[PDB]
């Protein structure tokens with residue numbers, strides 16, 4: 001298991017998200033669904049030139065899986081997936097400029113709901129989750145598990161769990177007072193309100 005420090009601006013953004021009083025927490029789901037949608041567009045675009053890139057799965061979809069026993073909400077996609085490099089430094093480097101602009105916007109009167117306009121919408125997961133686990137599998141690499149409970153660090157390990165073929169799975173270990181995002185009616189309401197025009201099927205699993 002490898003442990004990494006977040007870049008200073010990312011650690012600062014995650015602390016802001018965890019510490020700021022902000023009741024409109026539900027926007028985390030739109031951000032994660034939007035990220036899943038972008039990765040599905042990426043594999044779809046790549047498959048047009050190289051059809052063999054879909055040999056690890058033709059179906060392009062998003063699954064929302066609540067689990068009251070484990071207190072988790074899992075967002076699963078069959079998108080392009082991430083390499084070890086994407087998890088360790090590639091996406092964290094791009095996120096530095098977006099974090100800075102978002103921080104400036106907040107100081108100028110913007111609110112946490114506009115986070116996605118800065119390409120750092122993923123971190124809104126920490127409005128509701130005490131820990132986030134990300135399992136991913138790209139065609140050119142092995143299966144990896146990224147994990148963080150904030151606090152300035154994240155881990156990356158080769159995933160020994162069940163192979164997922166291709167795509168990304170975001171496991172939100174919810175805070176004790178945020179279990180409403182495990183309720184079927186609540187997830188349905190949020191999906192209809194913020195993610196109604198996503199170009200991929202979104203299946204809300206039931207328990």
Ligand SMILES: Oc1cc2n[nH]c(Cc3ccccc3)c2cc1-c1ccnn1-c1ccccc1
Nearest residue numbers: 032035036038039077079080081082122134168
């Ligand atoms: O399909 C995903 C779902 C995601 N949800 N949230 C995260 C963010 C993230 C990154 C690193 C480590 C941890 C989280 C996603 C990332 C991916 C994904 C897979 C491949 N490209 N791509 C991606 C999508 C949008 C922006 C950047 C990359």
